[PDB]
Structure formats: structure tokens, C-alpha cells
From a paper:
Skeletal muscle α-actin and cardiac muscle α-actin were purified from rabbit skeletal muscle and the left ventricle of a bovine heart, respectively. The structures show local resolutions ranging from 2.1 to 3.5 Å for skeletal muscle α-actin, 1.9–3.3 Å for cardiac muscle α-actin, 1.5–3.0 Å for ß-actin, and 2.1–4.4 Å for γ-actin. Like in previous cryo-EM structures of muscle α-actins, there are no resolvable densities for the very N-terminus, including Nt-acetylation, in our density maps of skeletal muscle α-actin and cardiac muscle α-actin, possibly due to nonuniform PTM patterns of native, tissue-purified muscle actins. In addition to Nt-acetylation in β- and γ-actin, we could resolve the methylated H72/H73 (H72Me/H73Me) in all cryo-EM reconstructions of actin isoforms. The inward movement of the D-loop (RMSD ~0.91 Å) is also observed in the recent structure of cardiac myosin bound to the thin filament compared to our structure of bare cardiac muscle α-actin, suggesting that myosin and not the regulatory proteins tropomyosin and troponin drive this structural change. Amino acid I287 is in hydrophobic contact with I208 and L242 in muscle actins and buries a surface area of ~113 Å2, whereas the interaction between V286, I207, and L241 in nonmuscle actins is less hydrophobic and buries a surface area of ~83 Å2 in the transverse interprotomer interface.
Actin isoforms share high sequence identity at the protein level (~93–99%) and the propensity to self-assemble into helical, polarized filaments (F-actin) from monomers. To determine the structural characteristics and differences between actin isoforms, we solved the high-resolution structures of single-isotype skeletal muscle α-actin (3.37 Å), cardiac muscle α-actin (3.07 Å), ß-actin (2.99 Å), and γ-actin (3.38 Å) in the filamentous state using cryo-EM. Our 2.99–3.38 Å resolution structures of filamentous actin isoforms show that the N-termini of bare muscle and nonmuscle actins have different orientations that contribute to distinct binding interfaces for myosin motors and likely other ABPs.
Residue numbers in the entry:
A (entry chain A), B (entry chain B): 2 to 375
C (entry chain D), D (entry chain C): 3 to 375
The structure:
Amino acid sequence: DEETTALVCDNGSGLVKAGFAGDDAPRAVFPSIVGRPRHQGVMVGMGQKDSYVGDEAQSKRGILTLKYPIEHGIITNWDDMEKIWHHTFYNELRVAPEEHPTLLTEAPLNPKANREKMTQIMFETFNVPAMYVAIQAVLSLYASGRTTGIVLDSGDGVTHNVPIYEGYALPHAIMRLDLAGRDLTDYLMKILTERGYSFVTTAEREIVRDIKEKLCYVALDFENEMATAASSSSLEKSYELPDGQVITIGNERFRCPETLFQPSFIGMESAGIHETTYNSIMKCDIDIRKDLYANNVLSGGTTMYPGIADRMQKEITALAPSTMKIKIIAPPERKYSVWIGGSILASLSTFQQMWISKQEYDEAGPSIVHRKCF
Amino acid sequence: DEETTALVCDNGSGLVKAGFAGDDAPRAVFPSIVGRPRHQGVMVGMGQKDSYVGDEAQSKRGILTLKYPIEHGIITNWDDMEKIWHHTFYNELRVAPEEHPTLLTEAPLNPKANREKMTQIMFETFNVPAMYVAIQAVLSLYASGRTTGIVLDSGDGVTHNVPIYEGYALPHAIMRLDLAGRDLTDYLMKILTERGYSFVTTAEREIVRDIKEKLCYVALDFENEMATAASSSSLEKSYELPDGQVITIGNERFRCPETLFQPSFIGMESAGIHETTYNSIMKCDIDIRKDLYANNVLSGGTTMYPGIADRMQKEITALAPSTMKIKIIAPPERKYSVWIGGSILASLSTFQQMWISKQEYDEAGPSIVHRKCF
Amino acid sequence: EETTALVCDNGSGLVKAGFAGDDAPRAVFPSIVGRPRHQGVMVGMGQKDSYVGDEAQSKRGILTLKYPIEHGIITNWDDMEKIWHHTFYNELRVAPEEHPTLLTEAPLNPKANREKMTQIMFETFNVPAMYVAIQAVLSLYASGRTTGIVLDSGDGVTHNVPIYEGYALPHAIMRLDLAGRDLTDYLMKILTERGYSFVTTAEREIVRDIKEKLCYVALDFENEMATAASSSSLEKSYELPDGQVITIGNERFRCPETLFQPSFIGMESAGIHETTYNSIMKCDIDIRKDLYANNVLSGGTTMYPGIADRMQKEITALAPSTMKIKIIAPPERKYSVWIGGSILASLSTFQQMWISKQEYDEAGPSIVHRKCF
Amino acid sequence: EETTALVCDNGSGLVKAGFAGDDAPRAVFPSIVGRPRHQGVMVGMGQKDSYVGDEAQSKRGILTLKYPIEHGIITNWDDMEKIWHHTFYNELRVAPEEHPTLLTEAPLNPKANREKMTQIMFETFNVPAMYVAIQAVLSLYASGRTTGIVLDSGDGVTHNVPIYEGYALPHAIMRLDLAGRDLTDYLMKILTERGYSFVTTAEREIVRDIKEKLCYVALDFENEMATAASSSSLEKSYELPDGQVITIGNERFRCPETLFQPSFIGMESAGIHETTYNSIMKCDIDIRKDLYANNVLSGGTTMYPGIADRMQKEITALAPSTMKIKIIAPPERKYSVWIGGSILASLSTFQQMWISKQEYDEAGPSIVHRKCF
Ligand SMILES: Nc1ncnc2c1ncn2[C@@H]1O[C@H](COP(=O)(O)OP(=O)(O)O)[C@@H](O)[C@H]1O
Ligand SMILES: Nc1ncnc2c1ncn2[C@@H]1O[C@H](COP(=O)(O)OP(=O)(O)O)[C@@H](O)[C@H]1O
Ligand SMILES: Nc1ncnc2c1ncn2[C@@H]1O[C@H](COP(=O)(O)OP(=O)(O)O)[C@@H](O)[C@H]1O
Ligand SMILES: Nc1ncnc2c1ncn2[C@@H]1O[C@H](COP(=O)(O)OP(=O)(O)O)[C@@H](O)[C@H]1O
Ligand SMILES: [Mg+2]
Ligand SMILES: [Mg+2]
Ligand SMILES: [Mg+2]
Ligand SMILES: [Mg+2]
């Protein structure tokens, strides 16, 4: 109880996590997808809706078109986002937002107008008493109970990096890279055509994504793994499509995740995630690098490939001096790391003074977000 | 016990020595540095201070800025000095100064206002029952148990000279030189850039200082030492930085301490320390010079370079007549020579009458320091 | 050099063959294999059991037409060996033992398609050398250009690929299923609303010939349907082989419109005007200017009247108004791929990239995917 | 005169070359070496494997730009020999066998940087003589002065050095890391807050051109941000090569401000107005009066509008109010170093300090650090 009962929402990109503050796990998880009917629509007395949002669209995806409003972190369809927020407040959580402060998350290095429009909708359409916006990668350090370390948060829209030393951030050592899990699915679709399988419908992008989540893995070494797959056939697995017609996957199993370390497979000029996180460490001060090397933290859904922790260690020690020690912390839960940190933050007694009240918004306007109250 | 238990404090410049009177060694040694946070400061519930003073600033020097209150000996930041004195009385010594007379040190040829402000702070903010101020180089003769001799006290702020003959000082033969250990570190930073190493951050000045304290040494002869280093590579040592990336030092090893004997490397017009101490001897009376030549005393931290005692002897006998004998006394301990003399002085039964009492300060004011009670 | 290299363009539904260094292909004939359907009374006739090529078109009234290539990928390997034998001994009248050959292949195809083609040529026909090239790359050789974006639409598949100063961008290549074969099927379906039925596979040729002579692309679709709804000045007559002339109304300009609106059949992909715009925006920022002014058209299905003006109108509606957009349409389009192949197989610098018999024996059929494509 | 000495200014990001005794450099081109990135289809093109100079700028859409020099020090010695070959045979069209050359070097640089430059010129190119001079010393020759303090800020490093009546003070020389290259990177970061992304190394040239045309220095920073917050009269438009014009607001005057407030990136050093004040106070007491009234500006990165008035305002806030302070800004600033080099290499008294081939053979590469600098 306590009559405060703050709310936590993690918009993300492609997955929505919602729940109450002070719990252990989110109470509602569902994709952020809005669908529209495509075909003629014969017969009568059915009483069927004109748009489906959430898990309902996944069930009926065979006749309707999937569309994603949020992309690369920035929201592009504001009319669709108000539909998703209405679904996770009245239909799933079954709560009235009039007496419930909410907490939201935002990726680093985003357009300023993205934050301002979110504040207008919550404070006017939903009439929340208070609200807040926090960086996703900062909350990931609250979950682990740490104060020092470098966090690599890779999700579906964008992966970013930020170092923190004893509760102080370094804004000039923050790196952002577009490569994410959405671009990995598209690459898998392209290289699957070389075996004879065609997946072009937007409703068939979910079929390819499910294959990636179950079969793909990261190889420790790329040159000699392609040699073993070229001769023997012990690296093949079978997948059953919904209508049947089972398929076989060969060396494409470990080729799609490799794009993270070699982003030249799509055509980008940036370096891999192992070199991006090394440049951030070398951008900080000299005497704080030692504690940053031994406190590498992994978070995000796209980081749960098997063998990704061992591959990252091998590449990092090849660049760093051989004297020091390097370790990577990978908690058993990674997808909900951001939400857990948000629940912890919204329960401290010292945090109850940094809420953005309704009175402040009326006097100052939507520009109050960029002030000392972030 | 004895319920008197006088206190001894040596402010210095860059190092603070504190302890009780009648002991063998100081009980508290820590740098005189005050630091301020530099970066944004994300996170909550940390409860972190706004300023760190002493050994705490050295540990966290990677995010904060180091600042020194005393320069060339005189105090420039009076607000910061009250912070250091509070740290060495309640936090480190763990004592109440209300029932503890204190003894302080001061360099020769200093502004008059420097002494007056020190008396005001101790007698009003801390409410000491008594206090005293003594010259640093006079106390260095108490430690050695001598009465005659010339003392060259070189520290971090300023080096000075003063001759004493059988308990009588000669104020007109006192020489003060600007060069000290702080200017030696800056010269090492400049000549290190010719090999490819850059050290510009104020927190990186501690890295360069530690190299000087471990590798540098004084060469007996400068012309032929540069010839051996030019051909062979047997004069090089390696240093490991905190993050790794070991470095190599060549002929810069013996070039930085040479500035003491040749102050033209920075641009000063004054003579070296070997000629400054010779002019002081020739400024005294004719028949007392014989005892001054054979009683040369070395004190201070910056005088603990290897080979500095033999180099000083070689240059001095080149100027003095060849008939007489010249020797230099270098005790195994040199950094604590001033503190040891202060402890001895504050324990004699005949010294208990020259304390500056609270009653005298109230009646006369801060100008009582310049009277017969120094 | 006395090489006299050979050039062959398999395509899908039309075969172009000839010698290297000439101006036009020497043999053009459909790729169709037919089988008798009826009883077969009478004696002393001495009639064959299968007809391939132009022979099947003449006798299509008693036999069934079958296509071995669908959307580009070969599905009947036994029938393809029959077609290749026809274009080497019966039409070209040549012995392939002393004649290097050049073949074409569409982008984004199964890997096994290339490997099986190499096995047949190097073993059944015993060619001394062979090569495989992309169809849309050869279309730029014919025009004598080095920069530009090529939209090659044929009978099986239309594809797009940008090239800038002799460098390709493999990540900006788009492939679309829609082609000329799906346009004929749509015409058959909408012809039933007037009373005409065309269901036999030998009657698909009747509908195709109507499309090649009457259909055209309209500049605007909304107001063209208004003029056809009121007046009857947009109707033409076609005479069937046995007579019974027919009339075509607004179906004349409705079948080609499927290219710009692929929702008429049920596909979710965008039209050819939006597919080629996405490819341009997928490249680098400073090379887009030269790509806008060097749009090249090739392929048989691109020879609809008014298709060049319609493409220009839609493209400038999306691109910024500052720059200029033009489309290059050579007077010959069906033979653009073959002409580029003849030019490539004659340069002195190309004589080193042939896949020799010695290399195939040592390495095997996997040599195609190596540096020698 | 058969001597015809050569002058070369390597710099960092721009190369100035020409003959001695002229008015302006004859060849100016960026110091960039590019490598192809993509597949490279097509044949008969005959295209090179690396482009250096202005050629790489034209074709930057398919290749990667790389800079050999960084912060004054040369990091890629294999690439530098390619640039020097380009400015001697391809652009200047001269044979260096009978042409003494003059080179420039920044203060407080690694000793090995000077030695390697002497080896390449005296062995690979076989010059009869050569010399190396400090960049900021040559800037005083152009103005025809003898006393003054020179602040030379370029693309790699800004440095300061006071000179009084032909005598230098080596102990009052300050070197700062901040330069024009770090200003471009800051502009890229703060441009993302409006929605524009510039991440490709070929897109760093787009951002640099915006800085050279729109950015300016504001006299006061606190009240300028107030006017830009309310009105929209401080916005200008820029047209990208493909179109899609953009708008710049208060970022117009925020990027150059980093010079006076280097805490925007994270550096702890003071601004250029306080660095030049500390150098003056490091000299002797009676020579400061002539140094205050002879402040000289040189370098490309000093040609921001309003930079001369802003520097004056901050300097007089620290110096005593009795004396007068002025800043000399010649109409030409980018070529100030080259002009001084041409003047020096023409005096009759300078013809004795050349480093001859005979001296190098007898002494070796260490002759550079001797009395003949
Ligand atoms: N077990 C797994 N293996 C590989 N990838 C996964 C796995 N589980 C999820 N993913 C990928 O992670 C993405 C989800 O990331 P998520 O944590 O939801 O980020 P966000 O909250 O920003 O959407 C999906 O696109 C999916 O492709
Ligand atoms: N072993 C050593 N060799 C050379 N220099 C030293 C050594 N130890 C200390 N120093 C120098 O001496 C200085 C400390 O002098 P110190 O005795 O503390 O004088 P003060 O008490 O006036 O600060 C330091 O700056 C350091 O550079
Ligand atoms: N004049 C024309 N107008 C419209 N369509 C045509 C015309 N001529 C040919 N076509 C179409 O083009 C197709 C032939 O394309 P073609 O160039 O042979 O491609 P491929 O070589 O891949 O078979 C035929 O199916 C036909 O429908
Ligand atoms: N008009 C201008 N306004 C602002 N900056 C400029 C202008 N012209 C040139 N610059 C900057 O000056 C730099 C060139 O400096 P330059 O004189 O070439 O030094 P160097 O010779 O050491 O390369 C470029 O990086 C550019 O950003
Ligand atoms: Mg996330
Ligand atoms: Mg001392
Ligand atoms: Mg074709
Ligand atoms: Mg320059």
C-alpha cells in the first residue's frame, strides 16, 4: 500500500515492460506493435475492431500488417504511441493513472523534442501527478548493486556505452552505435535466400526472428569455425515452420551474430562492439582505467547470445596491456535489468524530492525537463 | 602524561607533519591537498561529500582537481588552510586543542601579515591556551645536538640558508632562493615531452613526481656523463604507469636534479646552491669561517637525492682555500629533522616561559608576535 | 585470337544466343518444351515424342507447354539439357568443344543454381572455358557508361543495383517477385468480367500477344478511369486465330498499372517507383546526385508506351525539388543484356578471368564462388 | 639565379607549397590518402588502388579518408612519402635534385620527428640542402616586425611564444592540445540533438564546411543565449549535396566558444585568453609593456568573425588598466607562415645556415639538433 505506489514503464523498442514499484519482476510484457486489417472483410455480425495493439496483433498477424512506432530510440508515430500507452494502463495493468506517479526511460544522445513531447502527453492526456525520465544505462547499475563500472546496453533499437566511476558520469566518453538486434534479423533474412527460402512479408519477419532467438550463437573464432562447417555436417539444426516444411541451418547459424564484431557485413564503417568499448575506456582519465577494466557489465536482450561473454574477453585483452586483469559481469537475468534498477530507484526515501510535479509544469512548461530536474 | 602535552605541527608546503611533544617520530603525515569534484555526478543514495582533504583526495584524484593552499611557503588560500588544520586536529590526531599548546614553523624572510593571520586563527577559532612560532632552519640544529654550523634547508617551497656560531645568528648572512622541489617536477614534465609522453592534468602531476622520487639521481660530473649516456644504453630504467604502458628514462634521469646547481635551465639568473652557500660563509666574520666550513648540515626532503653529498663537497673545495678541510653532515633521516628539533625544544624546562599566553594576546593584539616573544 | 567466344542469355521464356563480337543475336526462340496430349491415330507419320523451341509454338494446339525456369531459378534440370542441346547443334550449328561460353545469372539466387550449371557445361558439353555474370551489370556495358542505377525487369524477376564509377554496392540491391509473367495472369482474370474464358495453357499465348500489342501505361490513373467510363474512344479490337473479334476497354491500361500498385494481386511490397527510391537513399549521401541523373531502363517488360514519363513523375514527387532527374531509355531494350555480354567477351583484359578446365578438375564445382565468379 | 629554393608547409590537414621569392603558394591541397572500400565490379576501367590529395575529395563517397599527421607528430610514415611525392612531381612539376627545401615544425615535439624527416629528404629525394624552422617564428617575418607575442592556432595544435627584439624566451612557451580538429568533432556531437546524424569519415567533411561558413564568435555568452532562446533571428540554412536543407540555431556560436571554455569537452586547461596572459607574466617585468601592444594573430582557426574583439575584452580584464592593449590581425592569416618562409629563404645572410649533403654524411641524422637547427 502506502498510497504512493509509483509506476515504472520501460518503452524500449519492440518490447514493453510495465509494473509497480517495489516488486521483483514486471507484471506486463508484450510487444509494441499496432496492426491494421489488409483484406476485404466479408460476412456480418462479427463486430470486429479496426486496429489491434499488443499481443492481440501477434495472434491475428496473418491478415493484418505489423507496424513499429518507435525506431532507433526516437518515436516516429505519435498517434500510435498514445494507443500503446492506453493499452498498458487500462487493459493490462488495470489502473487509473490519476493517482500514480510514473517513471520513464530514454536513450542517450537523442533529439531534444523527443523528451518534451513525452511530458506533454502524460501531464495533459493522462493527468499524472508526477513523472520522471532517466537514462536506461544508468538504471542498469542500480540492479547489480554497484557504483563503479562501464555498462554496454545493447537492445533492439540502439546500443550505447557510458562509464561511471564512484557515482560520477563522464558525458564525453559516451559512444552510440545504431547496430542493434533489428538489423541482425534483416541480415538473416538476406542470407537465408541463398539456400532457397524466401521471407518478404512483414508478418514473416516474426518467423525469422524466432529462428534467431533459438538457434544462433557466437563462435569463439571465425576463421577455423568456417573450416569445420565446410567439411562436416555436425553443426546443423532443424526448425519447423508453423505449417510444416522443416528447414535446415548450416553456417548461417553463427554468421548473423558475427555482424556485431564485424559491422562491415552490412556496409557500416564503424568498428565492432569490442573496439568501441575499448575507445571509451581510453577516453577517460589515466588512473581510473584500472577499475573500469575489471567492472565491465552486460545488459540488454541482444547480449544473451551463447558464448558472447567469452568472445568479448578474448578481444579485449588483445588490446589492453597484459599486466592487468579483465573480467565481464553477466547476470543470469539481462532483459529485465533496466526495469529492476528503475524499481529500486523509485523506492528510496531520498528520491521523493526530484519528482516533476504538476505545479512546476504549469508554471514553467514542457521545457522544465531539461532543467536541473531531468 | 604531565597534563601539559604540547603539540608540534609542521605545515611545510605539500606535506604536513603532526604529533606530540616528547616522542620520536610524527604520528600523522599526509599531503596538504584539497580537492573538488569536476564531473556531473549521476546516481542517488551515495551520500558523497563536496570536498576531500588529505589522503582521501589522493585516492579519488581521478575525478577531482588537486589544489595547494601554500605556495613558496606563504599561504594564499586562507579558507582552505582552516580546512586542513581542522583535519589534523579532530580526524587524525583525535585531540581537543582547548588544553594543548601548539608550536608552528615559519620560513625566513616572509611577509609580516603571514605571521599575524596565523595567530588570529589559532587563538580565536581553536582557542589554544598558548602558541609559538619558530624558524625551520633553527630547529634543524637542535636535532643534531649541535651549536655551531651552517644549515641548508631545501624543501618543496623554498630553500634558505642561515649560519649560526655558538648560539648566535647572523641575520645579514641569510640567503633565500626560489628554486625548490616543485620547480624540479615541472621541468621534468617539460623535458619528458621530447620522448613522446604528455602529462598535462593536475592529477597527472603526481605521476611525474613519483618518477622523480624513485629514478632521478645527481651525477658527479655533467660533461662526461652525457657522453656515456649518448653511446651506451646502460643508464636506462623502466617505470610502470598505473594502467600499464611502461616507459623508459634515459639521460633525463640525471638532468632534472642538475637544475639545482645550474638554475639557468629554467631562466633564473641566480647562482646554484653551491655558490649561494659559499657567499654566505664569506659574508660572516673572518675568524669564524673555519668552524663554519667543517660544520655544513643538510636537511629537507629535496636533499635526499643519491650522490648529492659528494657533488656538494667537490664544488665547495674548488672555491675555498686548499689549506682547510670541508665536510658535510647528512643524517640518515632528513625529512623529519625539523620536527625532531621542534619536539626537543618544546620539552625543556627553560622554554616554559616564552609561550605566548591568551592573556597577552587579548591585551596587546595580533602584533604581539613581532615583539621579544617571537 | 581465333577464340570465337559464345554468348548465351537463358533468361526466362526467351533464349538469346550468338557469337561474340557481333551486333545482334543470331538465334532467338522461346524456352518451351511440349509433350503430346491426345491419342495419336495413323501410321507412317514418324512423329517425335517432344518438341522444343519454335516447333512447339506451331503445334501448340495438341500439346502442353511447360516452362523450365520460374522467376529465374531452374526447376526442371532434365528439360534444360534439352534446350541447351537445341541452341548448340540445331540452331547455331556449332561444336561446343572449341568455343568458350558466357552465361548470365540474376542477383540473390540459390547457391546450388550456379554449381549445377557449371557441372553440365564442363562434363556433358566439354567446353574449354566458361563464365557467369550478373545480368544488370552487363546492361551498363551496352550504354558505354560507368555510373548509374539499372532497373532490369524481364519475365521472371525485376532487380535493382546501383553502380558508381565501377564500384557496386551489394547492400543496396533490391529484388522483386513481380514480373511480366504475373501481368499476363492478371489480364486473364480480369478478362472474364467481359465474357471471355482463357484457361488452357496453350491459350496463355493468346492472352500474352494481346498484352504486347494493346496495353499501355497511363500518366494518371484516377482521371483516366473517368474518361473511359463515359466515352468509348479508348477501345481497340483484336482478332482471334479462328475469328470472333473481341473488344478491350479500360482493361487496356489496368494490367500494366500493377507494377506501380502491387496490391492488385495481394503482394505487400511497394511499386517499382518506390523500390528504386529506397535503393538510392540506401547509398552514401554525396553519391546520390550522380545516381539521380543516370537512371537506366532495360528489359522486355519495360517497353510499355508511356512508362518513361510515368516513372519520372513519381520519382520527382519524392526527391528534393532542387536537383534534376532523367531516365535513359535506349531504342533497343530487349537485347541490352546480350550486347553488353558481347562487348565484355572481346576485351583483351578479360582473357585472364576465364574458368579453365584445369581449374575445375583440381577444385571442383565450388570454384564458381571463388574470386573467379 | 639557378638557386630557386623551395618552401613547403606540411601543417596538418592542408599542404602549402611553392617557390621562394614569390607572393603566394602555387599549390594548396588537403593532406589525405584514401583507399577503396567496396567490391569493385566492371573491367577495362584501369582504376588506381589509392588516391592522394584533391583526387580523394572528389571520389570520397566510395573510399575512406585517413590523415597521416596528428597533433603535429607524424604517425604514418609510409603515407607521408606518398604525399611528398605528389607535391614534387605531380603538382609543382619539379626535380628536387637541384632545389634546396625549407620545412616547418611545431614547438615541443618528439626529437625523433625531426630526425626521420632529414633521412627521407637526404636519401629518398637527394636534396642538396634543407632546413627546419619553427612555424611561429616565421609568422613574425611576414609582418615585418621584431617584437611581439604570436598565437598560432591551426588544425593540429595551438602554441604561444614571445619574442623581444630578436630574442626568444624558451621558458615562456605554452602548447595547447585544442585545435580546429576538436572543434569539428564537438559540432558533430551537438548536431545530434536536432536530429542530424553524421558518423561516416567522409561525412566529417560535410560538417567541417558548415563550420567554415556559419559559425562565429559571440562577444558575450550569457546574454546571447537569452536572445536566441526567444527570437528566431539567429538561424541560417545550409543545403546538403543531395538536398534536405537544415537549420542551425544556437549551435552557430557554441562550437567556437570551446576555445575560451575548454571544459565543454573535458579538458582541465584554461582558455586561449588566459594561456596568453600567463606567458606574458612569465617574462621579465620591464619587457611586458611592449608585449601587450604587439599581440599577433596567425593560423586558419583564428579567422572566426568577431574573434579579435572578444580576445581584447578578456585580456584587458586581467591586465592593469593603465596600459594599452591591441591585437594585430592581418587580412591574410592562413598563408602568414608561408610568406615568412619565403622571405627568410631569400636573404643573403641566410645562405650560410643550410644543412649541406656533406655535413649529413659525416655527422648523420643527429646534425639537426646541433647549432644548425
Ligand atoms: N535468447 C535470445 N538470443 C538472442 N537474441 C535475443 C534473445 N532474446 C531476445 N533477443 C533479442 O533481443 C531483442 C529484445 O531486446 P529488448 O531487451 O526488448 O530491448 P528493448 O527493451 O529496447 O526492446 C529482440 O529483438 C530479440 O531479437
Ligand atoms: N627520495 C627522494 N628523492 C628525491 N626527492 C624527494 C624524495 N623524497 C621527497 N622528495 C621531494 O621532497 C619534497 C618534500 O619536501 P618536504 O620535506 O615535505 O618539505 P615541506 O615539509 O616544506 O613540504 C617533495 O616535493 C619531493 O619531491
Ligand atoms: N512490346 C512489348 N510490350 C509489353 N511487354 C512486352 C513487349 N515485348 C515483350 N514484352 C514482355 O517481355 C517479356 C520478355 O522479357 P525478356 O526480355 O525475354 O526477359 P527474359 O530474357 O528474362 O525472358 C515477355 O513475357 C513479354 O510479356
Ligand atoms: N573561414 C574560416 N572560419 C573558421 N575556421 C576556418 C576557416 N578557414 C579555415 N578554418 C579552419 O582552419 C583549419 C586549417 O588550418 P591551417 O591554416 O590549414 O593549419 P595547418 O596548416 O596546420 O593545417 C581547418 O581545419 C578549418 O577548420
Ligand atoms: Mg532496453
Ligand atoms: Mg620543510
Ligand atoms: Mg532478361
Ligand atoms: Mg599552420
